[PDB]
């Protein structure tokens, strides 16, 4: 999803 990939721990 690149920028939209999971940005969390």
């Amino acid at each position, epitope marked *: *999803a690149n*920028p*939209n*990939a*999971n*940005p969390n721990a």
Partner: antibody
Amino acid sequence: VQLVESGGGVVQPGRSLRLSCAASGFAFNTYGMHWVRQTPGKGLEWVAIIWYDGSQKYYADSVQGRFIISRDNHKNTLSLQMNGLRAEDTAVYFCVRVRFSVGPHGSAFDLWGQGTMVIVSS
Amino acid sequence: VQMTQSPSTLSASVGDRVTLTCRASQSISSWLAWYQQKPGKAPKLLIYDASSLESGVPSRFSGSGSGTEFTLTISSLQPDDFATYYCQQYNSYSFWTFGQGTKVEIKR
């Protein structure tokens, strides 16, 4: 549980302004975080994202090269450095947390600050 | 991905069933969220993943749709539901973009 933005105000065009957002009541270092802005005459416009550990950042084209997003997971703050401000950056700026999720994809925006107003006018 | 909300504003009375529509210019699967916003306040998340209800949001709110066509339904409007409702896509490689909102306002 809250996000509280600061640093807004009146800034001349071309000049610079740093916004800050103080997060409390949650595990801030585990969350991706965003800036979203709103003028009255356009709706909501996404501005920038930063990964939980600071390792990835992405920007909207309208601000690419002029804005910098950063975070301090020790003081639990998000910041937006805004350089070369234009009249069209006048907006309320919201600090925004992504809804937590597992698996490969990001999620909606589940927690918002009250916003801080920046007025770019000479 | 451009998000389209029509109509931009809509009159209704307490008790009415209200349906808001949101069209996406390309398929976004189910990566769609709905927010409510009142004047001077931050948007509040109502629905995520196009049909999952956010914690603490009352059950008269429901969402449906996939692909390019989504709707938000208020089964019976209550007095604190007059507001602006935004949809927003968070699809893979699509960054984040919002509809222009549908402002639900009280009749006459």
